[PDB]
Symmetry: C3
Subunit: 31 residues, 3 copies
């Protein structure tokens, strides 16, 4: 378990970093 857990955490971290990029972008497109 703990092993997968960490692995799933690394995955999550990457998911987030993508989303922040979408957001950063979207912000340029608006106000």
């Amino acid at each position: 378990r703990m092993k997968q857990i960490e692995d799933k955490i690394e995955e999550i971290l990457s998911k987030i970093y993508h989303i922040e990029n979408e957001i950063a972008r979207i912000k340029k497109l608006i106000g």
Copy 2:
């Protein structure tokens, strides 16, 4: 202690999914 950890993870998963949906609709609305 471990089960808590796990509940935490499903939580993070559900919300991320929510967020990816919002972002979708926001694009639609501001674009094609």
Copy 3:
């Protein structure tokens, strides 16, 4: 081992809260409601 995991899970929930606020303000900005 277990603590480090917990520490990182809280860091994640923090980040995630912040993005949800970002979203809220964007939604406002374009009139989503």
